[PDB]
Amino acid sequence: MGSSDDPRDNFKKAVSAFDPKPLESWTGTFSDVKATVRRQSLSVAGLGSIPSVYTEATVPVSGNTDGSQLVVKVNINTVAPFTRRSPLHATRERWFSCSSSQCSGYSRKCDCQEKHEQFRNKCYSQGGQYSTQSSKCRLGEKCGYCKQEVYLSKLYLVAASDGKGEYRESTQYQSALYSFGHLSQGYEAVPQDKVQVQLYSEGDPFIALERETMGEGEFGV
């Protein structure tokens, strides 16, 4: 194990190691739409402008759906072909679980009613709908969840080096966006007629920044 006492050190090392030259060859198609290699610059306070390179295409939803899923066939030079299916629409549930941190009373017998009530009221203030599951909301209970409807707008994909100078879909990163799971994508509040698809390499500073800043895009609390 290793870790620096400088919070930005891991990020700086990633920036130094980043070689975008192979990515210039990332031409091809996304579901038969012509891809374009894009060179962007990140602005990171104290570190300046940072290169980032991805290949992208806008895929129409029409003609690229399989039931409720957008079907993205990645056919990019030097990247082993792969498909991502991603839901056009998701129902995002954020659950309130009663934990000791928000529990009122004697440890073994506490409940989170006040904090749950706040969470429920917060949901409605954010335009969500709430489902209450446990009113008593005792320690360890799943008390309820806030529900939001979202629609895929920007799909982030990640490729990793193979051993051999080319690329394949990343194992570790199912998205370039923190927290890097398959539903860590760009969403909007209403249905979309097209989706922007962006393919990054694992070592891109965009992904490093997402990681080292926990999605915030900048360092600091």
Kindly summarize this structure in a few lines.
Keywords: Membrane, Transmembrane, Transmembrane helix. With 221 residues, this protein is mostly beta strands.
Name the descriptors.
221 residues, globular, 41% strand, Surface glycoprotein, mainly beta, five-stranded antiparallel β-sheet, 2 domains, 13 strands, 3 helices, 14% helix, monomer, eight-stranded mixed β-sheet
The description of the largest β-sheet is: 8 strands, mixed
Tally of strands: 13
H and E order: HEEEEEEEEHEEEEEH
Strand content: 35-45%
User: What structural category do the secondary elements indicate?
Assistant: mainly beta
Helix content: 10-25%
Gyration radius (Cα, Å) is: 21 Å
Distance between the termini: 24 Å
**Individual helix count:** 3
Number of domains: 2
Categorize the overall geometry. Answer: globular
What does this structure look like?
It comes from Trypanosoma brucei. This is Surface glycoprotein. The radius of gyration is 21 Å and the shape is globular. The strands form two sheets. Strands 3, 4, 8, 9, 10, 11, 12 and 13 form an eight-stranded mixed beta sheet that branches. The chain folds into two domains: 146 residues, no CATH class; 58 residues, no CATH class. The chain contains three helices and 13 strands, in the order αββββββββαβββββα. The protein has 221 residues and is mainly beta.
